[PDB]
Amino acid sequence: ATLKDITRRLKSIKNIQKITKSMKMVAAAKYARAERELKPARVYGVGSLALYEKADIKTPEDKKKHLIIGVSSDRGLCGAIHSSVAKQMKSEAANLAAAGKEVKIIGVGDKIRSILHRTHSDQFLVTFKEVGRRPPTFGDASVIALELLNSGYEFDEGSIIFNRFRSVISYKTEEKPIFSLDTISSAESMSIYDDIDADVLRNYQEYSLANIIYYSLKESTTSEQSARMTAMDNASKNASEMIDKLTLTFNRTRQAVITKELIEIISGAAAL
Amino acid sequence: GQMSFTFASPTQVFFNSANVRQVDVPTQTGAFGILAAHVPTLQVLRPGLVVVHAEDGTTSKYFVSSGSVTVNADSSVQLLAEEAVTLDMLDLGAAKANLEKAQSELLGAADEATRAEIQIRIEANEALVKALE
Amino acid sequence: DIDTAAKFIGAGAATVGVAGSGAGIGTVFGSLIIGYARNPSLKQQLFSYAILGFALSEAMGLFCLMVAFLILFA
Amino acid sequence: DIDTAAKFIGAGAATVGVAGSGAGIGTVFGSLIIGYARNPSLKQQLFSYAILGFALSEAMGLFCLMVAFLILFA
Amino acid sequence: DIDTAAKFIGAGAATVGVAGSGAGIGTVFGSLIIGYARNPSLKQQLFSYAILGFALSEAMGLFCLMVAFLILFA
Amino acid sequence: DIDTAAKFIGAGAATVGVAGSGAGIGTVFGSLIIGYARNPSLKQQLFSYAILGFALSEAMGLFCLMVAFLILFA
Amino acid sequence: DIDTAAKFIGAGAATVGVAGSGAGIGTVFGSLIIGYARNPSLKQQLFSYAILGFALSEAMGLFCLMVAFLILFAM
Amino acid sequence: DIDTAAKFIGAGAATVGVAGSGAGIGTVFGSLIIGYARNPSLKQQLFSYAILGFALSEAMGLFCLMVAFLILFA
Amino acid sequence: DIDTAAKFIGAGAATVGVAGSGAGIGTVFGSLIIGYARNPSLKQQLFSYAILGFALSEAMGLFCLMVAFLILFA
Amino acid sequence: DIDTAAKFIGAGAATVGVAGSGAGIGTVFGSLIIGYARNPSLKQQLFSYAILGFALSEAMGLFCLMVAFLILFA
Amino acid sequence: VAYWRQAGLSYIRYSQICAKAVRDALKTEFKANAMKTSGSTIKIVKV
Incomplete structure (x- = not known):
């Protein structure tokens, strides 16, 4: 194109590179904080899950009510975080809907409610916004657990789908089951558990719910901070690579226009 | 006959599959001590102070506000408090x-x-x- | 006389009542312990209930003894 | 008089019963403590049940003692 | 005159059998307190079972006193 | 006559053995209350076991009263 | 005869040993009920112990009646 | 001869101490059931403790029976 | 004489009052065992209450024995 | 002789005391079973307390039997 | 049941209140650390 077009395009892409470098650095800082804060939350979550891990509970196959919770965030440019989470959500949703189970969906984050807006439009029971803006505390998990308990849906089985943070580059979408005291009480593996009324058990179930939601929130925050870091890194690298060719085009077009101008000037002088 | 004690607030951690001898906890049904082979139970805490004695005779006391305690078949205790602070922090x-x-x-x-x-x-x-x- | 014989036979038979006391009060001080093991903080009120139970249970052993002495002297 | 001696022995025996009611009251005031410790929020209702239990169990000791007195004076 | 004395002693011994009813009432009303403080939201059913237990454990005491009177006056 | 006198005293002493049945019924119906408070779901089977224990504890008291009536009338 | 007369009161005294026996039966079955409410999955095994339990608690108690009948009949 | 009658009545009264041991065996084997239901993983040790307690309970349930047979045949 | 014979009757029949204290001691030490299994870190306070309960319920058997002696030798 | 008959009666009656120790031993060794079902790690101290309670509740039945023998001999 | 369950609460709220009580009763220096970590920010969307 003309030199003006190359000038404008190079300006815009230089601006893009600057902003993406900024986002990469800010996301790296946020990820560093989140990873520091996730070390104890991992121990906490594993402790919460221990009972269900080694006191084998399975919900009997004749319970209609299922729940799907999908953990994600609001801010975009996170990569395939929201995509993978929602894809797994809907895969499991359809799988369960084959067996004639009245599935419900809860999304923790705007991206999940948006993505699953077309399909599963009515199955939503509640979703939550203002996620990821700041690290998710335990108060956030307690709010989600409360708003689940109060909502007029006594689920029988549930699953929560989030992004287990493996490393800075690799995270794996994971699902974790969650049970209901209607199922806890009538599990044969729970007979050995002494001093268990049908009341301390509902308190314990509510606390376990808050626990697992908090754990999934912390994993999700770490995973997406890393994912945004890497996505911004790739974007900035590609922007710099584009600048590499665009500056050459700038220089060549400037030289060509200079030569043409000089040639036309000398032609005019020769003609007169 | 050893105990695998885990004990953590959401924010911090105190014992991570450690080896303690006794743990005294409040539980919304009483206030009981857990030892190397206590019978399995689940309980939820009330605001109290959990006291832990290590293999050597030293006692560490932490005020927990709420949470849960799980004593399991393999004598692995998991004591998750929503807010635990040493008594000097009050x-x-x-x-x-x-x-x-x-x-x-x-x-x-x-x-x-x-x-x-x-x-x-x-x-x-x-x-x-x-x-x- | 046979009357001075009953003096002792009935009087002894009437102190069998004290067994009740010994039984009852024991249970009280049993439960207190157990209660104090479940909820140490209530030590004070637990002991208040316990002293009520002891007074109001051993009173009946005291009635047994009073009847025994009444017979012994009337 | 044999009749007087038999009356006195009969009263001595009839008063043995109150041991059972003493034991019963001991149990009632032990269970009050245990129930209170496990649930201190119900002190009023627990103590009401305890009052009924004590009254309605010492009723039997009073039965025994009135029987002994009917043997002795009446 | 010996037979009157024997009737007195036999009735006084028979009337000792309400110690069991006293203790049974104590136990049932202690269990009521414990099993209510353990689960307060069943007050009604727990008290119904307590009343049934009282009736069934007091049948024995009233039987002891009944036979005592039958011995005295027959 | 020492024969009927002895019979009366013997029956009177024998009939006190239903104190055991009274206390046993009390314990059975305290345990039923406690269990039902603990596991309100099992109420049907729990009452079945409670009635079975009641019957077996009634057996011995009724048997003692049978021996008492037997001796008093033979 | 005093010996015939006293035998009756001896038998009556001896037949009171069934009291504690019946109380023990009651407590055995009370414990059965509580244990079943704690762990209704061992329903059978528990009952078995209870059987054993009261048998002994009855069997040993039954000795009293043996004595009683002896006093009445076999001198 | 009263001696030939005192022996019979003394035996009939000494053989009353078996009630306590009947109750004690009942209690040990009720505790066994509760304890095994609560923590079945360790049932052999519970049975061992139950057999020990039962042995001791008969020990005293049979000391009084031994004294009864002694004063009956010696 | 009838007097000393009745004296022996009463001495023998007044010691049975120690049975209640025996059962009370048994129950208090059982509750000590239970409440120390629950909360084994109060050992000292729990044994304090246990020994208080034993002494204060052995007082009953002491009283029954001192009566059963004073009946003979006074 | 009347004194020999009285010896027999007193010993036979005083023997009944050991019912208390029989029941107490039963209670102690049931509580040991339960308190062991809870905390096996305490086995040593639980059995130490159980044996203490056994011996020091035995003492009462042993006193009763001792005095029964004293009457029966001296 | 408890005197708060009968009031229509849940153990999550009970734990929230207890943790609030403790955190509000800390030393003036640890109060800053306690408050910042425990804040809530999540917001509902009606369905």
Whole structure:
């Protein structure tokens, strides 16, 4: 194109590179904080899950009510975080809907409610916004657990789908089951558990719910901070690579226009 | 016959599959001690102070506000408190002021939910005062 | 005389009542312990209930003894 | 008089019963403590049940003692 | 005159059998307190079972006193 | 006559053995209350076991009263 | 005869040993009920112990009646 | 001869101490059931403790029976 | 004489009052065992209450024995 | 002789005391079973307390039997 | 049941209130650490 077009395009892409470098650095800082804060939350979550891990509970196959919770965030440019989470959500949703189970969906984050807006439009029971803006505390998990308990849906089985943070580059979408005291009480593996009324058990179930939601929130925050870091890194690298060719085009077009101008000037002088 | 003790607030951690000898906890049904082969149980805590004795005879006391305790078949105890602080991390004067404040608001039975909330606050502050004193 | 014989036979038979006391009060001080093991903070009120139970249970052993002495002297 | 001696022995025996009611009251005031410790929020209702239990169990000791007195004076 | 004395002693011994009813009432009303404080939201059913237990454990005491009277006056 | 006198005293002493049945019924119906408070779901089977224990504890008291009536009338 | 007369009161005294026996039966079955409410999955095994339990608690108690009948009949 | 009658009545009264041991065996084997239900993983040790307690309970349930047979045949 | 014979009757029949204290001691030490299994870190306070309960319920058997002696030798 | 008959009666009656120790031993060794079902790690101290309670509740039945023998001999 | 469950609460709220009580009763220096970590920010969307 003309030199003006190359000038404008190079300006815009230089601006893009600057902003993406900024986002990469800010996301790296946020990820560093989140990873520091996730070390104890991992121990906490594993402790919460221990009972269900080694006191084998399975919900009997004749319970209609299922729940799907999908953990994600609001801010975009996170990569395939929201995509993978929602894809797994809907895969499991359809799988369960084959067996004639009245599935419900809860999304923790705007991206999940948006993505699953077309399909599963009515199955939503509640979703939550203002996620990821700041690290998710335990108060956030307690709010989600409360708003689940109060909502007029006594689920029988549930699953929560989030992004287990493996490393800075690799995270794996994971699902974790969650049970209901209607199922806890009538599990044969729970007979050995002494001093268990049908009341301390509902308190314990509510606390376990808050626990697992908090754990999934912390994993999700770490995973997406890393994912945004890497996505911004790739974007900035590609922007710099584009600048590499665009500056050459700038220089060549400037030289060509200079030569043409000089040639036309000398032609005019020769003609007169 | 050894115990695998895990104990963590959401924010911090205190014991991570350690090897302690006894753990005394409050549990919304009593206040009991867990040892190397206690019978399996599940319980939820009340505001109290969990005392842990390590293999050597040293006692560490942590005030927990709420949570759960799981004693398992393999003698692996998991004690998850929503807020645990060592007793040196608490103001006696502030706690007593809060207790008297809550007792003063107890008169205002705004409703069953608010009556219950104020009574829970009074109970928690009572446990705080009794532990600090 | 046979009357001075009943003096002792009935009087002894009437102190069998004290067994009740010994039984009852034991249970009280049993439960207190158990109660104090479940809820140490209530030590004071637990002991208040316990002293009520002891007074009000051993009173009946005292009635047994009073009847025994009444017979012994009337 | 044999009749007087038999009356006195009969009263001595009839008063043995109150041991059972003493034991019963011991049990009632032990269970009050245990129930209170496990649930201190119900002190009023628990103590009401305890009052009924004590009254309605000492009723039997009073039965025994009135029987002994009917043997002795009446 | 010996037979009157024997009737007195036999009735006084028979009337000792309400110690069991006293203890049974104590136990049932202690269990009521414990099993209510353990689960307060069943007050009604727990008290119904307590009343049934009282009736069934007091049948024995009233039987002891009944036979005592039958011995005295027959 | 020492024969009927002895019979009366013997029956009177024998009939006190239903104190055991009274206490046993009390314990059975305290345990039922406690269990039902603990596991309100099992109420049907729980009452079945409670009635079975009641019957077996009634057996011995009724048997003692049978021996008492037997001796008093033979 | 005093010997015939006293035998009756001896038998009556001896037949009171069934009291504690019946109380033991009651407590055995009370414990059965509580244990079943604690762990209704061992329903059978528990009952078995209870059987054993009261058998012994009855069997040993039954000795009293043996004595009683002896006093009445076999001198 | 009263001696030939005192022996019979003394035996009939000495053989009363078996009631306590009947109750004690009942209690040990009720505790066994509760304890095994609560923590079945360790049932052999519970049975061992139950057999020990039962042995001791008969020990005293049979000391009084031994004294009864002694004063009956010696 | 009838007097000393009745004296022996009463001495023998007044010691049975120690049975109640025996059962009371048994129950208090059982509750000590239970409440120490629950909360084994109060050992000292729990044994304090246990020994208080034993002494204060052995007082009953002491009283029954001192009566059963004073009946003979006074 | 009347004194020999009285010896027999007193010994036979005084023997009944050991019912208390029989019941107490039963209670102690049931509580040991339960308190062991809870905390096996305490086995040593639980059995130490159980044996203490056994011996020091035995003492009472042994006193009763001792005095029964004293009457029966001296 | 408890005197708060009968009031229509849940153990999550009970734990929230107890943790609030403790955190409000800390030393003036640890109060800053306690408050910042425990804040809530999540918001509902009606369905």
